[PDB]
Amino acid sequence: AAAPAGAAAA
Amino acid sequence: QNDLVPDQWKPLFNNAEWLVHDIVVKTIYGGLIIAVIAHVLCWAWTPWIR
Amino acid sequence: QNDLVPDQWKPLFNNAEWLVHDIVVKTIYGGLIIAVIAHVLCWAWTPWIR
Amino acid sequence: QNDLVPDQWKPLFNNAEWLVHDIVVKTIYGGLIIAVIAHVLCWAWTPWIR
Amino acid sequence: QNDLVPDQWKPLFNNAEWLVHDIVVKTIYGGLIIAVIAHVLCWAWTPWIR
Amino acid sequence: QNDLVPDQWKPLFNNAEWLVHDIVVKTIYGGLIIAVIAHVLCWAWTPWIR
Amino acid sequence: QNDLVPDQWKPLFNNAEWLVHDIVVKTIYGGLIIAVIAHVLCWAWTPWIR
Amino acid sequence: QNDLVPDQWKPLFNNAEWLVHDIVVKTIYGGLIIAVIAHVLCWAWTPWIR
Amino acid sequence: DRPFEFRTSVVVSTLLGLVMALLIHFVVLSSGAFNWLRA
Amino acid sequence: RPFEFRTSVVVSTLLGLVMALLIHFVVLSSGAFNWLRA
Amino acid sequence: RPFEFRTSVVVSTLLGLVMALLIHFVVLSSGAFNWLRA
Amino acid sequence: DRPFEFRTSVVVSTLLGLVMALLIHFVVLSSGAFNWLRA
Amino acid sequence: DRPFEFRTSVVVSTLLGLVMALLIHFVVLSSGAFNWLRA
Amino acid sequence: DRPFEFRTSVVVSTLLGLVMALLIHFVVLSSGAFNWLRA
Amino acid sequence: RPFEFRTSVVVSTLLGLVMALLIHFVVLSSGAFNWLRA
Amino acid sequence: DRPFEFRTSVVVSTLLGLVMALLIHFVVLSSGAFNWLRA
Amino acid sequence: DRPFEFRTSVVVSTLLGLVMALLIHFVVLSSGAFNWLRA
Amino acid sequence: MNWIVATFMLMFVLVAFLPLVVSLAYTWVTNP
Amino acid sequence: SPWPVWSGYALCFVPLAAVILGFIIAARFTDKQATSAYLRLDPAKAN
Amino acid sequence: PIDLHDEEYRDGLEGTIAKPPGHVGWMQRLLGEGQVGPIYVGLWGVISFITFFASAFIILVDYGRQVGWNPIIYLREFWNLAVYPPPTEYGLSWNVPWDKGGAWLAATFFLHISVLTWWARLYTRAKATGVGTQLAWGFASALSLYFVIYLFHPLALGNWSAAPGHGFRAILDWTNYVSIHWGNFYYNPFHMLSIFFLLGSTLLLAMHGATIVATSKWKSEMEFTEMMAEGPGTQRAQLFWRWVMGWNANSYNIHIWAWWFAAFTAITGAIGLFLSGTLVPDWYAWGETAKIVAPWPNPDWAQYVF
Amino acid sequence: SAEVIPFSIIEEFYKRPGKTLAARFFGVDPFDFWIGRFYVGLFGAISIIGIILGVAFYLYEGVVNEGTLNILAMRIEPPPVSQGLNVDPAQPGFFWFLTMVAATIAFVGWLLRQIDISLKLDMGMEVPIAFGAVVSSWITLQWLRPIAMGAWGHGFPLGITHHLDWVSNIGYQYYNFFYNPFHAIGITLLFASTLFLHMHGSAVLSEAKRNISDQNIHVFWRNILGYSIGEIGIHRVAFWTGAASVLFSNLCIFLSGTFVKDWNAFWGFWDKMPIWNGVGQGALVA
Numbered sequence A: 001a002a003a004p005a006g007a008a009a010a
Numbered sequence B, C, D, E, F, G, H: 001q002n003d004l005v006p007d008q009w010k011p012l013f014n015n016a017e018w019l020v021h022d023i024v025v026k027t028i029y030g031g032l033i034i035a036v037i038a039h040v041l042c043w044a045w046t047p048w049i050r
Numbered sequence I, L, M, N, P, Q: 001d002r003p004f005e006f007r008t009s010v011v012v013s014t015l016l017g018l019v020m021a022l023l024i025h026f027v028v029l030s031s032g033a034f035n036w037l038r039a
Numbered sequence J, K, O: 001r002p003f004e005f006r007t008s009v010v011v012s013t014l015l016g017l018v019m020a021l022l023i024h025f026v027v028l029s030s031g032a033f034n035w036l037r038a
Numbered sequence R: 001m002n003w004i005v006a007t008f009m010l011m012f013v014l015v016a017f018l019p020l021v022v023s024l025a026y027t028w029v030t031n032p
Numbered sequence S: 001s002p003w004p005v006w007s008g009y010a011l012c013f014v015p016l017a018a019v020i021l022g023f024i025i026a027a028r029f030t031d032k033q034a035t036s037a038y039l040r041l042d043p044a045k046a047n
Numbered sequence T: 001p002i003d004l005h006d007e008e009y010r011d012g013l014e015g016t017i018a019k020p021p022g023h024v025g026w027m028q029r030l031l032g033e034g035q036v037g038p039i040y041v042g043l044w045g046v047i048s049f050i051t052f053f054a055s056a057f058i059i060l061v062d063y064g065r066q067v068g069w070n071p072i073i074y075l076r077e078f079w080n081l082a083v084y085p086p087p088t089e090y091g092l093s094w095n096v097p098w099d100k101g102g103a104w105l106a107a108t109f110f111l112h113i114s115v116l117t118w119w120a121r122l123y124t125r126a127k128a129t130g131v132g133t134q135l136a137w138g139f140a141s142a143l144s145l146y147f148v149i150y151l152f153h154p155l156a157l158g159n160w161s162a163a164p165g166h167g168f169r170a171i172l173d174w175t176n177y178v179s180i181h182w183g184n185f186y187y188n189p190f191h192m193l194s195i196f197f198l199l200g201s202t203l204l205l206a207m208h209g210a211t212i213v214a215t216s217k218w219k220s221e222m223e224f225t226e227m228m229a230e231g232p233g234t235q236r237a238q239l240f241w242r243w244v245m246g247w248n249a250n251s252y253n254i255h256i257w258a259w260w261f262a263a264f265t266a267i268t269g270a271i272g273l274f275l276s277g278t279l280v281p282d283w284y285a286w287g288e289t290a291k292i293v294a295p296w297p298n299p300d301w302a303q304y305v306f
Numbered sequence U: 001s002a003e004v005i006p007f008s009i010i011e012e013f014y015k016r017p018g019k020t021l022a023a024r025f026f027g028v029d030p031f032d033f034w035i036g037r038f039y040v041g042l043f044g045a046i047s048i049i050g051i052i053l054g055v056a057f058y059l060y061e062g063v064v065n066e067g068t069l070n071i072l073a074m075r076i077e078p079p080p081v082s083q084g085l086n087v088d089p090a091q092p093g094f095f096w097f098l099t100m101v102a103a104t105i106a107f108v109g110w111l112l113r114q115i116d117i118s119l120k121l122d123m124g125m126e127v128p129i130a131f132g133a134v135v136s137s138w139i140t141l142q143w144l145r146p147i148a149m150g151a152w153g154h155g156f157p158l159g160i161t162h163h164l165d166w167v168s169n170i171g172y173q174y175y176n177f178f179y180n181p182f183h184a185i186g187i188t189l190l191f192a193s194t195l196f197l198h199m200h201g202s203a204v205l206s207e208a209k210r211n212i213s214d215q216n217i218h219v220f221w222r223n224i225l226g227y228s229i230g231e232i233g234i235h236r237v238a239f240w241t242g243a244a245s246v247l248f249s250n251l252c253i254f255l256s257g258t259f260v261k262d263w264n265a266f267w268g269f270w271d272k273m274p275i276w277n278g279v280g281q282g283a284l285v286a
């Protein structure tokens, strides 16, 4: 979920 | 859509675009009248062509 | 959608393009007369060739 | 497509290109005539080679 | 394709390229004749080698 | 392909390149002749080594 | 490939590079002869070591 | 390909590099001889150590 | 599809009119021909 | 379709506007006419 | 085709316009004619 | 196939001719040897 | 195969000849040894 | 195999020759030792 | 491909050319010899 | 959900107040209107 | 959930106090109002 | 000016250019 | 008086303090984001 | 729904030219990519072209007029020719002779139009593809200083000769003269801020480029896919800068640092230049009143004399 | 494929002992360890010694020997040019020399430590090259030019607003400094570096959190400029331009006082070349 860019995409 | 537009301008216009176009042309006419009056007043004040 | 366009200019024009073309040529013809009158008035004012 | 083009110039033009070409050449001829008249008038005014 | 061009120049030209070539060479010949006449006139006016 | 080229120069040239070569060689020879004539005339005018 | 190249220079030259090389060396020899003649003439005119 | 280079220098030289080397060393020796002659001539002309 | 868009022409004409008004005001009022805002 | 009407319209209109502005600038700088003179 | 008609038309029109402008400016700055004199 | 295309030859020759014409005209005009556009 | 192409050699030779011709004309014109284009 | 290419050798030698010729011709012209392009 | 022979020959050629040019221009602009004198 | 956090409000207000207090104290000190910290 | 942590409060307050102490000492010293460290 | 020390220091200033040239040459050689 | 003019604080010292404090805080937050837990390729399998 | 092929291979005004792309070999070997073209030629792109070339034509023809229509003198003197704004005797007037300031006025108006239309081109072409509009606002930040230099600072000062001439050497002369006129520009605090940001931008560009090339064996330069999951190259870059400085960044926020460091330069420069003449007519004297100038009572001037 | 890793495992995976320069020269690195987040090795101790001593010497020369607590009014100045290349503990300019030597030691130690840390992580040597460019800039400003000119008094003073006085006076002694060719090249490269940094930052930020492919940015940069450089090419261009900007400006400042005295008289040859001398008339001559 947590992504290097600060996003939390399913 | 394409209902209030006359059949001549249906290929170019739309309902919302027709309404906004009418607004624009009325604004242009009013501005032209004001500009003519302003030019007449300024020429009466001091002519710019001597 | 090419019924207003004459048969000669069919491979180059469209209905909407034909309408806008008529608008443009009328505008050009209208502006040329004003240019002629403006030049005549300016020459009557002060000739630029001496 | 190539009906109006002469047989010699078939591999180079279309009908549309032939029409536009005719317009262009007529414009060039008229411009040349006007240029010749303007040059004669300007020489009659003040010759530029002395 | 390679039909109206002579057999010696087939590996270099088309029909269209051959036609355009011929136009260009005729233009160059005319320009050269005019240039020779102009240089003779200018020398008759004022020589530039003294 | 390599038909008009002499057998000595086949590894280096082609038919189109052989023809263009011949054109370039003739142009260079003519230019050299004209240059020799021009240098002789200019020396007869004013020598540049004194 | 290494058919026209002598046995000594086969590991260095190709078939076409050998011909181009020969052209280059002939050009250099001619240039050297002309340079020697020009240097003798210029010394006979004006020696530059005094 | 090491068959003409001597067995002493096989790890260092190739067939082509052996020939290029020989050319380079001959050029160096010739240049040294010419330089010695030039320095002797210039010293005979005007000595620079006094 | 559409040869001409109404929105693009509106944008271009509005911007041209504004630029022309600013330029003409500057040129006219910086020339000194008219007695406008004199100290 | 070789020639497009939109391109011709845009190019001609822009060329005319640029020419008009340039001629006005040159005539104003010439000083031959009274115009906005003091 | 080896040559397109639109390319030749664009190039020729641009060249003619540039030449006309250049000749007009050179003749204006020459001072030989009594044209647009202050 | 072919060394040069016809189009590139035409473009290069035309550009070179135009540049040379302009250069020679300007040199002759600014030289001051001929009357031409004077005074 | 070939070390050089015909196209490259033609381009290089033509460019060099044009540049040398222009350079020599400029040097001779500015040297003043010949009358040529005098006022 | 071959330490250097024929094309690069030709390019370098030709360029060096042209540069040296131009340099020597300009130095000898500027020295003033010979008449040459006087007046 | 080994680099020693090529590196040595290239650096030798460059050094020789630079030395020759520098020494010639140093000798010319000193006046010790006649050489190119007006 | 509320438009703003409490933490953001606290940070903004505290920082602005501290900056303003320092600026006003230094502006009043160097004016010379009051006999404060005078030799 | 609390807005701020105890560590951040301690760090911010301690740094602010030290910086203010240093600044006020520097200002009062450079004012020249008190004798203090005069020669 | 000594002209010997100055040229040595100029040589040092020129040698400072070397790692970038080597980087460009490495990039060129390693990408055929 | 030993004190700078008010323009000295307006144009020189307040911007310097702002620059230093902003650099410190931006560095703190970028390092906080960089060293957190998010999707990464496993170093054991990748190498 | 965006079709990239249609976006790059469409015909008409709203389309591209140079359709069969080229290829350059040395660019392929050095830079890694060599395809050239096609290029979009839609509206907002013809207007910039036409107005820029109108201004350029005006400038070059005036160069020729100044030289005397002599091509050789034109070539000799090309790098110290210029067209200058009307002198100080005129104010902001436009009734100026063509060889004394009118040409500068016309050319500068056309240049303004062209730069604005280029901004519009960037904006609309960013929206047409699937990307956001960050280059347009960077160009806006750059254009703030341009419009301060050419339009607003002369307007506030009251004359057109406060603006640069159009020439290779004229910009250097403008820089020198503007620094000399208003005291010393080294004591301008916003000039200090601008230099801070410019040198920081150069430092940051060098650092990012070097650290991405050094870790490129593990494909670290594919920064689009590294913002979804980071592999060995990005991990090594992070570890390098952590063991050097004690702190590091991401493959995402480093480019944020880049954007803001490059943006602040023009904004600080514009503020400083605008304040330069209108509020503080002398920066060395101001710095003396603000306590930032060193005394220097006994200079050793033997260093500054031949 | 990918999973959540807490960054403790990524740091502990890559820590290895003994792959540095001192480990290859002596067979072991005496200080091969980590303090906090920093890697201490050899050249990590030399650098810290130099840093501490340089700061101490700078502050002693400023606060004492000048008597000012104002940090923006100090003049940490070298010896006069009449002293030559001599150092004397009993004369002014001694704490400038000590500070200069300590700073040199610190900068060279930082460079060598960067080389060490590059060697530990199996990277290339790009960062040491890019930093060595500016280290050489410092060396030519403070070592090479003063030695060639002939005195330690030809270096710049280390005051915060006062080193800008040296820049101004040196730039107006060799007037006009704008007409220096290497100066122009360096300025061009600085401006280009800032432009490229803005362009790259915008380009990467504009595609970050979007459901798009990785080919959209190439189409964007080809619609606007006709040409898109690539992903490794832009970072290479960044590196090269950044280094070259200062590499070229070393030469201008070195040649200002040694081989040239005037950058307006440098361009006197241009109008005297035979191709275009003697072709104009009055006020258009030369």
Ligand code: BCL
Binding pocket: B027, B028, B030, B031, B032, B035, B038, B039, B042, B043, B048, I017, I018, I020, I021, I022, I024, I025, I028
């Ligand atoms: C009189 C003194 C000057 C002169 C000074 C000016 C000034 C100053 C201006 C003009 C403008 C014009 N002049 Mg004039 N002009 C002079 C001599 C001439 C001569 C000549 C041969 O001598 C000619 C042909 C012209 C011709 C022109 C036209 C180009 C133009 C007419 C307006 C127009 O196009 O309407 C186009 C339609 C409109 C302008 C509509 C406007 C739309 C709305 C009404 C804008 C109102 C703004 C309002 C405050 C906003 C508030 C809204 C909020 C939501 C509340 N002028 C003399 C030398 N002239 C004007 C111009 O360039 O405008 C383009 C202009 O500003």
Ligand code: BCL
Binding pocket: D009, D012, D021, D024, D025, D028, E023, E026, E027, E028, E029, E030, E031, E033, E034, K003, K004, K005, K008, K009, K012
């Ligand atoms: C600016 C150029 C214009 C153009 C303007 C004209 C004009 C004007 C004309 C043509 C004419 C033609 N054009 Mg067109 N034409 C253009 C582009 C094209 C293209 C292309 C692929 O782009 C093509 C295929 C053509 C095709 C053609 C031919 C169909 C047609 C006949 C040419 C011919 O046979 O003359 C052979 C060429 C010559 C004989 C050369 C003549 C030039 C002379 C020698 C130059 C000096 C003139 C001097 C005053 C007279 C000679 C004096 C000497 C002392 C002898 N044009 C461009 C857009 N074109 C001609 C026509 O009749 O239209 C139906 C014509 O008059």
Ligand code: BCL
Binding pocket: E009, E012, E021, E024, E025, E028, F022, F023, F024, F026, F027, F028, F029, F030, F031, F033, F034, L004, L005, L006, L009, L010, L013
């Ligand atoms: C550069 C300008 C034009 C062009 C301008 C001309 C002109 C003009 C002519 C040709 C002619 C030809 N051109 Mg063409 N031609 C061009 C492009 C091409 C291309 C190409 C793919 O690009 C090709 C394949 C050709 C091919 C050809 C041939 C088909 C044809 C005959 C060549 C020949 O045998 O005599 C070529 C002639 C020589 C090789 C020798 C002449 C050169 C002289 C020596 C140069 C100095 C002239 C001077 C007067 C010296 C003479 C006196 C001396 C003191 C002895 N041209 C370009 C685009 N071309 C000729 C033609 O059609 O009729 C025969 C012709 O007159």
Ligand code: BCL
Binding pocket: G049, H031, H034, H035, H036, H038, H039, H042, N004, N008, N009, N010, N012, N013, N024, O009, O010, O012, O013, O015, O016, O017, O020, O027, O033, O035
């Ligand atoms: C008072 C001074 C005297 C004088 C006294 C001397 C003295 C003393 C000497 C010369 C020497 C020379 N003089 Mg002298 N000379 C004078 C005036 C002149 C003038 C002139 C116009 O006035 C000229 C043109 C010369 C020219 C010369 C040269 C022939 C020669 C320099 C050798 C050289 O350049 O090697 C440098 C070049 C190289 C090292 C490279 C060699 C390689 C060759 C050229 C082949 C290269 C191409 C090949 C492909 C290699 C490329 C490999 C690639 C990597 C693939 N002198 C005056 C009169 N001169 C010197 C000499 O050495 O004689 C031979 C010498 O010692």
Ligand code: BCL
Binding pocket: G028, H027, H028, H031, H032, H035, H039, H042, H043, H048, O015, O016, O017, O019, O020, O021, O023, O024, O027
């Ligand atoms: C006479 C006045 C000066 C002097 C003026 C010069 C000048 C001028 C030159 C020298 C050069 C030399 N001098 Mg001395 N020299 C002086 C006194 C000395 C004293 C001394 C103890 O007094 C010494 C030890 C030297 C030593 C030297 C050597 C370093 C060198 C010659 C050897 C050499 O390198 O050739 C080694 C062999 C080669 C370089 C082979 C290269 C030659 C090839 C053949 C190139 C020839 C060019 C040719 C035209 C190319 C044609 C190409 C084809 C047509 C394709 N000189 C006095 C003080 N000296 C030369 C030099 O520096 O060269 C490096 C040089 O140019």
Ligand SMILES: CC[C@H]1c2cc3[nH]c4c(c3C)C(=O)[C@H](C(=O)OC)c4c3nc(cc4[nH]c(cc(n2)[C@@H]1C)c(C(C)=O)c4C)[C@@H](C)[C@@H]3CCC(=O)OC/C=C(\C)CCC[C@H](C)CCC[C@H](C)CCCC(C)C
Binding pocket: T199, T202, T203, T204, T206, T207, T210, T244, T245, U050, U051, U052, U054, U055, U058, U099, U100, U102, U103, U106, U107, U110, U127, U130, U131, U133, U134, U157, U158, U159, U160, U163, U242, U243, U245, U246
């Ligand atoms: C080459 C293009 C540009 C560039 C790039 C460059 N710089 C770099 C790097 C790169 C690639 C690093 O990797 C490196 C880095 O970030 O490592 C942490 C660095 C670096 N470049 C830095 C600064 C810097 N770079 C600058 C410029 C540039 N660097 C370029 C224009 C400038 C200026 C003036 O333009 C400075 C200030 C540091 C942030 C860092 C180097 C860190 C370092 O060397 O540490 C050693 C010493 C200390 C931390 C303290 C030193 C204390 C002194 C001993 C006492 C004071 C004496 C000093 C002489 C006084 C000076 C006073 C001045 C007012 C005159």
Ligand SMILES: CCCCCC/C=C/CCCCCCCCCC(=O)O[C@H](COC(=O)CCCCCCCCCCCCCCC)COP(=O)(O)OC[C@@H](O)CO
Binding pocket: A005, A006, A007, S015, S018, S019, S020, S022, S023, S025, S026, S027, S029, S030, S032, S033, T253, T256, T257, T258, T260, T261
């Ligand atoms: C005239 C001079 C004026 C000077 C003013 C200087 C300005 C300073 C302010 C700096 C910005 C502070 C940001 C605070 C908020 C950031 C929060 C954060 O951590 O942001 C992260 C990225 O920030 C990050 O790169 C960290 C922040 C961005 C990176 C740095 C950006 C600045 C680059 C240079 C600009 C000035 C700095 C230097 C000045 C000399 C993303 O995380 P999210 O997925 O969204 O997290 C969600 C939750 O966990 C709660 O947030």
Ligand SMILES: CCCCCC/C=C\CCCCCCCCCC(=O)O[C@H](COC(=O)CCCCCCCCCCCCCCC)COP(=O)(O)OC[C@@H](O)CO
Binding pocket: T245, T246, T247, U035, U036, U037, U038, U051, U052, U055, U056
């Ligand atoms: C130009 C002016 C002079 C130059 C000044 C240079 C000094 C400082 C600049 C900035 C330094 C800080 C940089 C970032 C901060 C370090 C980050 C950090 O916090 O790192 C710490 C390391 O510092 C540690 O030990 C301590 C590391 C040593 C710190 C002290 C070094 C002082 C150097 C001498 C300074 C000059 C003295 C002159 C005397 C007059 C430890 O953190 P942890 O709790 O273990 O972290 C938790 C985990 O995630 C990792 O373990």
Ligand SMILES: CC(C)=CCC/C(C)=C/C=C/C(C)=C/C=C/C(C)=C/C=C/C=C(C)/C=C/C=C(C)/C=C/C1=C(C)CCCC1(C)C
Binding pocket: P021, P022, P025, P026, P029, Q010, Q013, Q014, Q016, Q017, Q018, Q020, Q024, Q027
């Ligand atoms: C211009 C002029 C002339 C004037 C300007 C006017 C002006 C604007 C004034 C403004 C004044 C302000 C803003 C003052 C602020 C004072 C503060 C914040 C004090 C903080 C104290 C913090 C203190 C004591 C902190 C103590 C911390 C301790 C004891 C910590 C201890 C510990 C902790 C937390 C961790 C480990 C265990 C340990 C016990 C060691």
Ligand SMILES: CCCCCCCCO[C@@H]1[C@@H](O)[C@H](O)[C@@H](CO)O[C@H]1O
Binding pocket: I022, I025, I026, I029, I030, I031, I032, I037, T090, T091, T092, T093, T155
């Ligand atoms: C959009 C730009 C704002 C326009 C500002 C106009 C400033 C006018 O300022 C003018 C001067 O420029 C002019 O020289 C004298 C002539 O006596 O009169 C003033 O009013």
Ligand SMILES: CCCCCCCCO[C@@H]1[C@@H](O)[C@H](O)[C@@H](CO)O[C@H]1O
Binding pocket: U083, U084, U085, U086, U147, U150
């Ligand atoms: C690493 C370089 C250390 C400094 C090199 C300079 C050596 C110092 O040697 C200097 C000489 O260079 C100088 O000529 C005279 C007086 O000027 O006094 C000497 O001590």
Ligand SMILES: [Mn+2]
Binding pocket: T208, T212, T223, T255, U200, U204, U235
């Ligand atoms: Mn990046």
